[PDB]
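notes to self, project folder thing:

trying the whole complex as one job this time. last attempt i did each chain seperately and stitching them together was a nightmare. six parts in total, labels are on each line so i dont mix them up again. if this works i'll redo the older ones the same way
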Amino acid sequence: SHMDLGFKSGIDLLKQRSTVWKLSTSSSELDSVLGGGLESQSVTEFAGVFGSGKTQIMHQSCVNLQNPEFLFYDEEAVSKGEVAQPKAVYIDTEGTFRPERIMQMAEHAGIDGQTVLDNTFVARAYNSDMQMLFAEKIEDLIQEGNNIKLVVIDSLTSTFRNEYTGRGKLAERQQKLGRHMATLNKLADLFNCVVLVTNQVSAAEQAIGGHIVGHAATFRFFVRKGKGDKRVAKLYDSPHLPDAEAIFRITEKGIQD
Amino acid sequence: SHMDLGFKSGIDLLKQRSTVWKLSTSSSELDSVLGGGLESQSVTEFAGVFGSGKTQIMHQSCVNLQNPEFLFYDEEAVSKGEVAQPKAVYIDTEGTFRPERIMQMAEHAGIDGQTVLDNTFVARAYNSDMQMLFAEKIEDLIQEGNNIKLVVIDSLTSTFRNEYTGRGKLAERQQKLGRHMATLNKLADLFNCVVLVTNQVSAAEQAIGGHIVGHAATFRFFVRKGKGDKRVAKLYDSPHLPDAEAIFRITEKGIQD
Amino acid sequence: SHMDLGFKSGIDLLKQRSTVWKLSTSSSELDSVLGGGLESQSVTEFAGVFGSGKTQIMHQSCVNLQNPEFLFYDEEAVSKGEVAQPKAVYIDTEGTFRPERIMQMAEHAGIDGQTVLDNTFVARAYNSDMQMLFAEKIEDLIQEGNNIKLVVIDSLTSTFRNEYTGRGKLAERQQKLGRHMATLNKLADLFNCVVLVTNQVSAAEQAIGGHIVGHAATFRFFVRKGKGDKRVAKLYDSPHLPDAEAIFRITEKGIQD
Amino acid sequence: SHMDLGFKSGIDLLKQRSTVWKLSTSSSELDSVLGGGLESQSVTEFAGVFGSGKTQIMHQSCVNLQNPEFLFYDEEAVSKGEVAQPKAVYIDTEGTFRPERIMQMAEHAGIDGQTVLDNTFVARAYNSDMQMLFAEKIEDLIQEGNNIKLVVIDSLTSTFRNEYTGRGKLAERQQKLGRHMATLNKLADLFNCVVLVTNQVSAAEQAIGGHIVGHAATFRFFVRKGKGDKRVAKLYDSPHLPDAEAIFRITEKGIQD
Amino acid sequence: SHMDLGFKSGIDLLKQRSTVWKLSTSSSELDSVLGGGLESQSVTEFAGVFGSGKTQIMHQSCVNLQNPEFLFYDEEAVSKGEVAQPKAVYIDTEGTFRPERIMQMAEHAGIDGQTVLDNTFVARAYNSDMQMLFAEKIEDLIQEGNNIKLVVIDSLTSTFRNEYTGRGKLAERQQKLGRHMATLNKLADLFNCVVLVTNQVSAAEQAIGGHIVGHAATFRFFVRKGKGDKRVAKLYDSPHLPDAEAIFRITEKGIQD
Amino acid sequence: SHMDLGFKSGIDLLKQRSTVWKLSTSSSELDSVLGGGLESQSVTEFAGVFGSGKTQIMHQSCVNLQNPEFLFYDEEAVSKGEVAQPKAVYIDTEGTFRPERIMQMAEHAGIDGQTVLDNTFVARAYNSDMQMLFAEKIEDLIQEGNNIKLVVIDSLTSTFRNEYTGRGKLAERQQKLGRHMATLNKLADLFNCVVLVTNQVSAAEQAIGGHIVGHAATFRFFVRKGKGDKRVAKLYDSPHLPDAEAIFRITEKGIQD
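result (full assembly):
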């Protein structure tokens, strides 16, 4: 009864810790910094400038979800049915979803592009209202028998930024964002899935949204452009992992190395 | 089912791509820059100064909609009925609709002007509330048996600009705009129509409304005055078309060359 | 069913045009500048300083409405029944209605004063709420069988200006005003009557209200004080008439010359 | 029918003008400046500094209302029942009602003080909400069978000034005030009574409340202190009376000369 | 019927003055300056710095209410039944109620302390809403049969001051305060009880809350510290008493001299 | 009857004091400064910079709750039943709860860590709404049969601080804060339990939230860093204890000295 009130005993916390599964990024170093891969029941943020690869990682994650081998879990804790026919939701904030990139990534990966597209729900959000409502509707998707295992918010803050210009209404912006973050954390946890969000950085080195976002994101990264198609992801916040940097590349095959 | 919620599988996206039809502008160069013509399912923005041709293109579009040969589409994906007895909605926020100019453009196009007027609904909006409400009521018009295939918003921002003065209400202005842009995209998508919007520019060049408007418009142009009756439309934003310029003219015949 | 939704076809607009009737101002020059007289289906604004004659023109219009020979219309487009037993509504925001001036003007015009006073409804409005509500209640007067054919708002902006002092509530002011402008245009349109409004000006030359008012008034005048009882009305905005000035007098008889 | 809607024909306006009655102020010169006495159906304002005699005039009006001979009216237009058992309402905003002063003025005028106190309702208002609600409830007092013929608001702006400090809420204060003025004029008009209000002045020389109050007060005075107990009431605004000054005194007998 | 609407005839007002009773403060000088003691049907305010004795006066009053000889009234206007089993309500804003101080004052006064504690209702208010609701619930305590004859608000403004920072919120703070003052005056008046409030002062010399409070407090004191155990209460606002100072002391017995 | 209305007689207050129990902090000096231990029916605040020991005290309290020898109470006033099977609520605002730390503290204290984890409900709050709602839901946990005797709010203000930036919202922040403080006090009082909260400090040494928080917290500490693992807890606000400092240490066993 208590868990229905949003509470969890210390024992409930430990138990649920065993049902955590992870999704590979197709990058050795990146998976390593992640301590296995992208964790479920948590929100992972990739913040950087445009072209840094935040969106590539999002597309790559939708493809990988469709490869049974890219999902790592404790067999005696997570049944094979729990992760069967896994579906992905991609909330698109600026029209960044590219089906052809999904195909390309699928092909070079030996996955059926057709299947990734068929199992990835795309929601085009033109304002913060839609963005937040789509997130909440993910429960409805799961209620219609869709095993949503990956939620992608690309991007987390552009609609809020575009709607709240002026530090005179920043509090209203922060509260709405905090509400969205609670929703994102709620579905990662209640539906044992991984939630990923992309974000931008401001002038001195912080992801947009302040602490309201930061205190609510379990894993946080800054993504920088190396030379050429190289990228470096820096994990600077995680509950128990060490801060570390991982280098990788973005090619015709997607995320690699 | 998922579609009921606003989500589209990647496969659905590809499928909807096939039903996109285009409307000619009566200018080869502009049509070529558009990659064929003004696209259904998208919001196309024409931004420029007063007298730059924005309103003329809107009128030309209403006339052209009444000539079957001016609509281009895949006869394998779009039935004749889908585009039969097509009608236009012209939401006029400053009193720019001119039935006599419609008559003229039609006459010179070998199109009956009476037919254009009989199939063009004009909605005079004196404030932003009326403007947004009219846009929402387009669904009610369709539901009455009117095959709306062209929606013109001339102009998109004059009302919002006349109401929200001072950067102290900008947030509210931006949120109302975002709501309007969402509705415009919804009409274009759910009813497979072409949605055109005219807009102004501000001081190195930007269409009024910032990113809330920009991010939500699929095709964006800046229209400039050339010598005499000449004009140049510069497409600077599109999903996959190259950024190019097209020259054309505004004559007694309408848009030409 | 479309007109029920506030939409009108191009054809409906032309048909609309055929039923327009005009009201003489008693000034040959002003009538000429107007293209015959004050048009129904449009809002006509007279802006200027106190004493420029705006209020005098409003009273003169109420008197002239009671002279069948001062209403010009196409007999084959408008029945004598539509313009029969015409009544006026005068919404007064500063207590400028003078029954004695009505009497004096009538007498000197060979019109029965009592008939003018008996067919002129006066509404004293002390704030914008009353002002706007009276305008909306004009529809109710009509249902009860009153052939309202002339609506006077003297003055248009006095109350809004007295309530929304400070450019900090200007946005709300502009929106309330836009709502009122829409209602005034609706009365003129739906009930085929002439709507006149008085207004003030400010510096380097503009009627109070900005574009929210400007875009919503079809005929716009600046009225200036000439020498003695002479006045000059300058039409600087109309759909198709030329910009021109008219000189007249305000005498014991009312508007003349 | 049109009466229900707040509208009145020019004829009704003239008619109602015949039912106006006046209340003597006990001062010959002041009664003369007033054109006979304080008029019913109008709001009369007395603005001045503290100690200028405003409150004394309010008390003297409550006393005089109980002497049948201090009410002047057209016996052919106003019935004796209309002015029978007249009662006053004194809305007290700073605890200025003084029953002993009523007693003193009454006896010195040969009126039974007990009768005055017995027919004078006092409403102590501690904030603007109470002040306004009390004024609206005067209608309910009349609806219960009380012939309310005099309404005193002492003072009109006191509570508004105390509540709306800072000019960032001035618009809200001006609108609330405008709503209050509407109510005061409504009771004067609908129940044919005299409404008196006291007010303060500020820097040059203007009653507090601006035009919102000013356009809504039919007769306006500035009361000044003369030598000793002498006072001068200056009428600076009236519909058809000349602007003039009246000197009078405040003694044990009340207002005199 | 008029009283039901909040109005009172002038006769009513006089009838009410006769039922006024007073509560001794234990200080000869203070009682003399008050005209006999703390008056019922009025709000009495003691303003000053921390340690000036405001709270001690509140405590002494709760104790004194339980000694019949400390209540002064006219037997012909107030029945012994009306003042029998009197009870006090103490609204505590910072946790200043001290049962041990009550016991002490009682003991030294020959009054049973348990009787005092048993007949004193304490309400700990942590914010303005609770403070305001507690005052309104006093009516409910009375309806339940409790003869509430004294209400202490310690302090009047602490919560309001803690919740409202910025001159841009001052308007809302003043209106909430005005609503609270209305309630305090209403219970003093309707239930014939004495209402006491403590307040702070600010720079030049005024009690916090401005005129909204000042205009609504019938008796007002500034309480200063003298030498050692001495304190001076200065009555500077009363409807009919002279402005005067009372010196008293805060001792083990409580208030004395 | 009055208990329902939120009022407590002075006798109720004394009787209430009789049932207060205290919880050991495992620090002899700190327990001494506290007059015995953390008191039920009160809110105790620990303010200090990050790493000062606040969160550690919260964890140590959850652990100590499960050792009956650490709860001190009057057996004549409090039954073994009231404190039997006590449970704790830990509202986690930044993700600071650590089950492993709970295990370690228990283990080294001779307490079964599994028992502590099993009887401690954790609530992760990502915004002020959630934070406040969990607090209120504690009534539900108790209703469902859980003997909640310890409530931890870690931290009290990080969410409010992250949501309300700028002085233009400070009033709204203070009021939300006030409501939350009232709720915390209410559960401490009604369910006879200990309520602990952690807070930050700013600039000239004050806990965040100002007086709105300060006035509502019965025991207030500023916790600072000594040398190495030493810490000093300074009690600067209590109802009857002396202001004093207690040095303690944070080690593998937990809070000690």
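what i see at first glance: Chain B is about 35% helix and 25% strand.
need to look closer tmrw
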